[PDB]
Amino acid sequence: ATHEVHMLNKGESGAMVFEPAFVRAEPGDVINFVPTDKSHNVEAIKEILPEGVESFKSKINESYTLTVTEPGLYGVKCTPHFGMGMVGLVQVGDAPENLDAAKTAKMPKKARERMDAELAQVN
Amino acid sequence: ATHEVHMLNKGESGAMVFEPAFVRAEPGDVINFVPTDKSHNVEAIKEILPEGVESFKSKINESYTLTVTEPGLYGVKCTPHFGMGMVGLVQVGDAPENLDAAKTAKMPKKARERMDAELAQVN
Amino acid sequence: ATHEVHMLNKGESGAMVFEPAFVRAEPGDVINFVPTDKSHNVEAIKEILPEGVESFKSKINESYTLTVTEPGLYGVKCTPHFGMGMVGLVQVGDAPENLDAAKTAKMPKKARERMDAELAQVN
Amino acid sequence: ATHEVHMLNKGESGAMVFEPAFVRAEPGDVINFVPTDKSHNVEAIKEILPEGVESFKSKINESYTLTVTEPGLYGVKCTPHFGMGMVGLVQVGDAPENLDAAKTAKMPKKARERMDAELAQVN
Ligand SMILES: [Cu+2]
Ligand SMILES: [Cu+2]
Ligand SMILES: [Cu+2]
Ligand SMILES: [Cu+2]
């Protein structure tokens, strides 16, 4: 299955946001990170990634197509807006092993607040 | 301003969901609840509602337009799916006075889990 | 099946638009006409409606839920923006009997231009 | 500014479609072609392309970012689905000089039908 996440200046969820901020996927799924507005990208939060998953960083304003082969939690940020809390979360498969890592990973205050909100969706 | 909330059997956020689950509005705004899938309605959570706001309960499968005049937090539920956690939150204006009431309001376990996730967006 | 049409001030398709501007449905389907921005409504174009279908006119800024029980073409307009060409088209079922009526119905110039574009999608 | 086009097996506009099928842009904009479904790509229609614009052909299932520097009409096709009418149109800037070329360019019957529908949006 394929999923889409938008990068936005302003949504219902606030300023500098990924929407949806949480994606539930299965191994082999595709996630498309697509700008709604200019100025954004997507980059892996290294401390919120499954084992063996390479970091990634898209170019500003480009759609980025991520295949989530490995199960677990994938945290993402927008590079210039990380401090403004622009973060998202993808859960791939059941019972993610890196839940604790995601709860404790160091990041800017607003990013941690939004990541904590996203973590509430883990199922 | 207008806002839109979809009533869904399933979304990225799970089963039986309002998407978006959080809306940020100002007095005079309208929020449209849209029957994207059949089987849903929208009903006020009486304990999460500003003073002077009349309760409401729409008919299954219909659109409902909520005009928010009074500032504060408005909690909403889908009647048949309340236990399945189908709840949403509208913040109207800055500095909502009823944050505590929203934190403590009694509801089914999954509803409380989802309301806690939504409350994290209050700004 | 349920379908959604947005009412917008400005889309890729221009100013004062329904998007999608064409919906392909089957008898018994539901179409939700939902504002993206304030100022819009949806109203039937009386001369583009199947036999026996009652006219409808939504209130400004409200989501409107239309059940398309009868087969044929349904033309819609936004009341205040009809002259600005804000029109849409729903095809319900195969081989619509009112195709000629839709091609010849009198309306403002910009509405006719956009209706002609929509009619190209009839299948 | 950014723009987004989805590559779809099916949409309201039919089978094998770009949605939106028409994009209005300005020089310097980017257009992201998003693999919402698998099986698609984006390729320039050589006869509908401004002067000095290099041809392009993306890989199946990938995102593609088109930077539009030169003004005029850019026609695009999906390679495997060209005969199925999977074509799109980008207008860059006012008063495009190559409208006639877009009207007459040779292509499969269904592609010409869909391109004629798209050309109706040129402004
Ligand atoms: Cu950003
Ligand atoms: Cu429900
Ligand atoms: Cu209008
Ligand atoms: Cu294709």
Number of CB atoms found within 10 A of residue A55's CB: 9
Closest chain C residue to the Cα of B65, Cα to Cα: C62
Q: How far apart are CA C6 and CA D27, in angstroms?
A: 27
Residue owning tokens 């199922």: A123
How far lies D89's CA from each of B55, D93, D103, in Å?
49, 13, 12
Q: Which chains, if any, share at least 3 CB pairs under 8 A with chain D?
A: A, C
- Residues of chain B contacting A123 with CB distance shorter than 8 Å: 14
End-to-end CA distance of chain D: 18
**C103 contact D CB<8A:** no
Contacts 24+ apart (CB under 8 A), D92-95: D92/D25, D92/D26, D92/D27, D92/D29, D92/D50, D92/D68, D93/D25, D93/D26, D93/D27, D94/D123
Distance D30 CA to ligand 4 centre (A): 20
CA torsion angle for D97, D99, D101, D105 (degrees, to 10)?
150
- Give the three-state DSSP class for A114: helix
Contact A32 D33 (CB under 8 A): no
Residue D20, token pair as written in the block:
């939106």
The Cα diameter of chain C in Å comes to 35
Distance B28 CA to ligand 2 centre (A): 26
Closest CA to A49 of A69, A21, A79, A29: A69
Strand pairing report for A22-25 and A87-92: parallel
From which experimental method does this structure derive? X-ray
C78 among the known binding-site residues? Answer: yes
For the purposes of burial, counting CB atoms within 10 Å of the CB of B100, is it exposed (0-12), middle (13-18) or buried (19 or more)? Answer: exposed
- Residues of chain A contacting B111 with CB distance shorter than 8 Å: none
In DSSP notation, D33-93 reads EE-SSSS---EE-TTS--TTPPP-BPPTTS-EEEEE-S-EEEEEE-TTTTTTT-EEEEEES
B78 among the known binding-site residues? Answer: yes
Q: How far apart are CA A42 and CA A86, in angstroms?
A: 9
Contact by Cβ (8 Å): B51, B85 = no
Please tell me the number of Cα atoms within 13 Å of C7 on its side-chain side: 33
CB-based contacts of A13, cutoff 8 Å, min separation 6: A19, A21, B20, B22, B24, B121
Our count of domains for chain B comes to 1
CATH number at residue C82: 2.60.40.420
Q: How far apart are CA D31 and CA D10, in angstroms?
A: 21
Number of CB atoms found within 10 A of residue A27's CB: 13
Contact by Cβ (8 Å): A73, A96 = yes
Domain that holds residue C62: 1-123
Q: Which amino acid is at B70?
A: E
